[PDB]
Amino acid sequence: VVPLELARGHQVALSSISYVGCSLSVLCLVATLVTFAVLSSVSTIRNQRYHIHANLSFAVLVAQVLLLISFRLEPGTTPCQVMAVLLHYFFLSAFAWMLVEGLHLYSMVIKVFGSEDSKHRYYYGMGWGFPLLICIISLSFAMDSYGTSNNCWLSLASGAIWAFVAPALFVIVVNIGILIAVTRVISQISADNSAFKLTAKAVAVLLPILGTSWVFGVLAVNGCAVVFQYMFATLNSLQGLFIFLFHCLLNSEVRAAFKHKTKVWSLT
Amino acid sequence: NTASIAQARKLVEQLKMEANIDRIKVSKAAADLMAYCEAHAKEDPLLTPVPASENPFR
Amino acid sequence: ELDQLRQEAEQLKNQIRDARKACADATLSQITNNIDPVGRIQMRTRRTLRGHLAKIYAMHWGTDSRLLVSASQDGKLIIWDSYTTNKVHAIPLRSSWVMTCAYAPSGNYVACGGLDNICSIYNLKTREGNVRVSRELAGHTGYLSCCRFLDDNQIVTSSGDTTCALWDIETGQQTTTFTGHTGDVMSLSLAPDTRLFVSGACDASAKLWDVREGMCRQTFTGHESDINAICFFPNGNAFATGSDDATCRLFDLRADQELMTYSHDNIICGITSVSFSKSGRLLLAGYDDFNCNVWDALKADRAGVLAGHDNRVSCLGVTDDGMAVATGSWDSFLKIWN
Amino acid sequence: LSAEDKAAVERSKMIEKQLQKDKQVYRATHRLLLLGADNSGKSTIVKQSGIFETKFQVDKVNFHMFDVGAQRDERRKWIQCFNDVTAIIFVVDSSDYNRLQEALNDFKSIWNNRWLRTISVILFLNKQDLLAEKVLAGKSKIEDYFPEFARYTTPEDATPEPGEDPRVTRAKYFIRDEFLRISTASGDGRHYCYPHFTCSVDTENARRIFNDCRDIIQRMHLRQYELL
Numbered sequence: 001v002v003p004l005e006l007a008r009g010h011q012v013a014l015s016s017i018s019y020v021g022c023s024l025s026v027l028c029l030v031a032t033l034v035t036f037a038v039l040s041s042v043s044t045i046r047n048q049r050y051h052i053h054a055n056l057s058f059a060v061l062v063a064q065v066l067l068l069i070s071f072r073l074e075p076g077t078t079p080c081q082v083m084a085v086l087l088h089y090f091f092l093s094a095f096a097w098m099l100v101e102g103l104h105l106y107s108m109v110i111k112v113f114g115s116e117d118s119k120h121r122y123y124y125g126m127g128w129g130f131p132l133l134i135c136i137i138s139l140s141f142a143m144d145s146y147g148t149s150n151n152c153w154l155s156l157a158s159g160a161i162w163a164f165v166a167p168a169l170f171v172i173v174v175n176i177g178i179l180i181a182v183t184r185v186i187s188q189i190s191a192d193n194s195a196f197k198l199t200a201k202a203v204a205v206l207l208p209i210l211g212t213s214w215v216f217g218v219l220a221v222n223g224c225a226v227v228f229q230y231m232f233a234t235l236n237s238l239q240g241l242f243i244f245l246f247h248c249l250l251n252s253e254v255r256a257a258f259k260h261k262t263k264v265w266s267l268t
Numbered sequence: 269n270t271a272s273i274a275q276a277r278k279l280v281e282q283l284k285m286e287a288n289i290d291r292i293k294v295s296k297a298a299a300d301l302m303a304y305c306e307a308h309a310k311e312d313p314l315l316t317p318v319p320a321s322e323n324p325f326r
Numbered sequence: 327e328l329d330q331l332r333q334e335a336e337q338l339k340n341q342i343r344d345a346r347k348a349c350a351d352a353t354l355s356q357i358t359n360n361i362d363p364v365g366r367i368q369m370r371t372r373r374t375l376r377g378h379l380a381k382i383y384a385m386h387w388g389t390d391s392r393l394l395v396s397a398s399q400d401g402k403l404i405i406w407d408s409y410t411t412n413k414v415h416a417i418p419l420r421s422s423w424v425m426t427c428a429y430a431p432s433g434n435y436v437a438c439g440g441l442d443n444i445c446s447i448y449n450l451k452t453r454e455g456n457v458r459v460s461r462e463l464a465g466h467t468g469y470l471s472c473c474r475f476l477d478d479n480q481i482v483t484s485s486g487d488t489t490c491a492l493w494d495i496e497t498g499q500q501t502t503t504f505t506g507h508t509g510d511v512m513s514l515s516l517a518p519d520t521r522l523f524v525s526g527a528c529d530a531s532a533k534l535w536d537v538r539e540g541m542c543r544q545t546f547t548g549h550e551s552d553i554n555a556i557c558f559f560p561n562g563n564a565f566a567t568g569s570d571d572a573t574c575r576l577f578d579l580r581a582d583q584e585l586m587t588y589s590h591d592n593i594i595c596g597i598t599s600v601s602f603s604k605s606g607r608l609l610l611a612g613y614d615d616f617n618c619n620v621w622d623a624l625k626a627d628r629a630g631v632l633a634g635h636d637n638r639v640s641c642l643g644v645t646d647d648g649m650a651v652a653t654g655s656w657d658s659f660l661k662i663w664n
Numbered sequence: 665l666s667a668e669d670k671a672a673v674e675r676s677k678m679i680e681k682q683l684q685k686d687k688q689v690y691r692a693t694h695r696l697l698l699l700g701a702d703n704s705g706k707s708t709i710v711k712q713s714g715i716f717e718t719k720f721q722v723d724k725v726n727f728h729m730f731d732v733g734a735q736r737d738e739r740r741k742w743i744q745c746f747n748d749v750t751a752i753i754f755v756v757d758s759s760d761y762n763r764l765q766e767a768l769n770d771f772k773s774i775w776n777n778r779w780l781r782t783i784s785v786i787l788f789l790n791k792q793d794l795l796a797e798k799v800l801a802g803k804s805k806i807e808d809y810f811p812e813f814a815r816y817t818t819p820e821d822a823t824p825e826p827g828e829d830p831r832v833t834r835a836k837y838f839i840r841d842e843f844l845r846i847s848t849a850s851g852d853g854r855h856y857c858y859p860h861f862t863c864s865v866d867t868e869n870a871r872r873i874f875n876d877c878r879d880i881i882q883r884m885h886l887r888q889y890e891l892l
């Protein structure tokens with residue numbers, strides 16, 4: 001498909017916004033990782049969900065740092081192709097991890113009876129490994145399509161895009177279905193009583209951690225892409241900022257644990 | 269009933285027994301506590317820190 | 327009659343309180359000030375055991391300062407060793423809720439109880455086979471609270487029938503009932519001499535009880551709350567009681583009057599467990615404020631905080647040799663300090 | 665760790681394996697506490713010396729019910745241990761028009777417990793087949809006991825049983841409203857009440873307890889995820 005990313009009136013104010021968003025995301029994500037690592041002795045941060053959060057944050061952090069390094073790198077040199085392979089592997093891993101989070105949410109809400117079953121091995125095997133299998137099947141046949149004269153990324157006109165867009169679409173449709181079901185359940189619950197507030201807060205919380213903002217990419221690649229690239233670049237990027245501000249400074253569990261840890265530290 | 273009078277007699281003889289417990293000055297008890305806490309202080313490895321050599325939890 | 331009894335039960339109390347007051351002329355705080363304070367204590371846990379499943383209520387040190395026991399809602403009793411953080415036996419039992427543990431002086435018998443109203447002992451050192459039930463005890467229509475071994479043959483216990491009872495393993499019969507308490511009794515401790523023991527109740531009172539003749543020896547003043555736990559001085563002439571009034575006091579046997587008041591403005595949560603050290607200078611109280619506190623028993627001055635527990639503490643004990651202290655909390659964790 | 669403690673570590677490993685095996689059974693079971701006074705359902709509900717325990721299987725879900733029959737009138741000093749139950753089943757006679765205010769008072773006392781402001785309560789009902797013949801004949805009309813019967817209109821939301829005069833539905837919703845009036849004054853946290861109507865010889869109780877527990881767990885999980 002024709003890229004049609006930016007030709008004349010959208011190139012600027014795109015790389016600078018990317019830099020600012022990546023810097024803010026990396027700072028907030030390293031802060032979130034430090035907070036998660038420090039607050040690990042408390043028993044309230046012991047369930048499987050916080051493990052998913054930690055792995056997803058680490059994957060997003062490493063992907064953002066790798067992309068930032070990728071921007072400042074010459075094309076047509078072996079490290080560029082190596083780091084492009086790493087780039088698409090890490091992005092696929094992040095997508096798989098958000099899919100795993102969606103599956104966990106579906107099991108926790110719709111299927112409340114059986115939430116606690118110690119599925120650590122299956123969750124890790126679904127998160128990692130699957131991107132590795134996709135990478136090996138892709139590199140068994142497609143190897144020359146890992147470098148472009150423009151800059152070293154995954155090529156567009158070669159036709160080896162299938163390794164990313166198809167899993168993206170699968171995760172997106174699964175996320176849409178799960179979000180629709182959860183919103184229906186929460187609206188049925190909230191109907192027994194401020195109507196906009198609960199649903200708006202729920203969708204805002206669930207947006208930038210489950211990966212539902214990637215739908216804009218399909219419309220950006222094909223369609224009237226003159227006012228949508230701005231949103232596509234100014235949203236998906238600040239994932240670290242959104243995840244920090246919504247699941248470290250506003251979560252109820254982490255605040256109490258932090259207060260208890262501060263009290264313990266000040267006691268002795 | 270008879271049970272009430274029995275309880276009355278029981279509490280009466282208990283209270284009468286409470287009237288003679290050979291009450292003595294409480295300063296003697298304080299001095300005894302002083303002596304016990306002073307003499308029995310060396311062999312307590314809680315108030316006085318003990319070296320790690322003579323410690324079985326090292 | 328009733329009115330005559332009520333009238334007579336006033337001047338006798340007045341004269342008893344007058345006699346108690348006349349004995350006192352200077353409390354402990356006026357005579358223990360020239361002794362140098364203990365100082366800062368930086369005790370930290372050496373190892374964490376963390377082998378349980380749910381909230382715990384009871385713990386007890388062994389005679390040789392090596393083995394200890396604990397109980398939880400899982401219905402499992404586990405004999406536990408601190409030197410090599412191992413375990414010896416796991417005891418399942420019928421009732422899923424138990425709030426009583428006891429280890430005999432001789433490392434043979436272990437007794438457990440709860441609200442099932444049945445007291446069951448276990449023969450650890452069986453002749454030929456595994457560990458099984460030895461003898462059940464019944465006769466109380468209220469929930470058992472705690473029990474403490476006196477010898478390998480006899481055993482005393484407390485229940486929810488506002489009365490205390492001692493039982494003989496042979497013939498399993500209640501030899502001498504202990505009556506004279508209105509509220510429920512939820513605490514009981516023994517003495518180094520196997521002739522006297524005391525218990526506390528929820529009616530803000532404690533009673534001195536004699537094992538042999540079964541006659542209440544001494545009464546005690548109020549505590550403004552319900553007593554949760556009690557202990558006994560190794561010397562055998564004093565003890566400390568706790569309650570939910572966020573205060574602890576020390577009562578000596580000879581004087582029969584409180585001499586120490588352990589109160590701080592910051593603490594408002596109640597007490598749960600009280601134990602003494604070997605020398606008798608330090609006592610530890612398990613507070614409801616998610617932590618434990620030490621107390622210089624000779625004065626009124628906090629000497630450190632044993633924080634580090636994420637849940638409410640239930641039981642706390644000190645080994646016989648007085649070189650370690652163990653605490654238990656509702657988070658199914660066992661913490662021992664050097 | 666010389667060549668003496670090699671057996672102890674493997675014995676501890678065996679104990680750990682046994683405890684891990686027991687963990688699944690313990691975690692796959694919900695515990696319920698059944699309250700109530702005399703002349704209530706009790707034996708009839710349990711039909712399908714310290715404490716009694718019975719178990720039932722519904723929709724391949726394990727359940728654990730508990731009750732007492734020897735505790736004294738003082739309900740404190742032992743309610744503290746019941747701080748991890750899923751819900752508290754409450755049973756009310758509701759057939760005899762007397763001895764009803766005390767039930768409401770103890771229900772309020774249980775609801776307003778400081779240490780128990782986390783568990784929900786399922787309000788059960790019984791003796792429906794006894795209410796009908798006692799209300800259709802006027803000898804013990806409820807108006808004398810509660811003078812506020814005149815000021816009562818049946819709620820707009822209703823599911824009346826077929827072939828029932830309006831007086832019996834009015835009495836049923838009267839009892840429901842009187843029971844639920846005290847509940848809404850406090851709470852607004854993580855627990856709600858749940859009125860129900862079941863006969864004595866029925867078999868639908870398990871379904872209602874199942875769905876109520878499912879709703880409670882769903883609400884708790886939504887609280888946990890901060891979404892709600």
Ligand SMILES: C[C@]12CCC(=O)C[C@@H]1CC[C@@H]1[C@@H]2CC[C@]2(C)[C@@H](O)CC[C@@H]12
Nearest residue numbers: 005006011014015018067232233236237
């Ligand atoms: C990295 C971004 C930004 C969003 C994303 O993560 C991938 C996507 C790939 C194409 C990039 C785009 C940022 C802006 C670029 C780099 C334009 O300069 C041309 C290609 C665009």
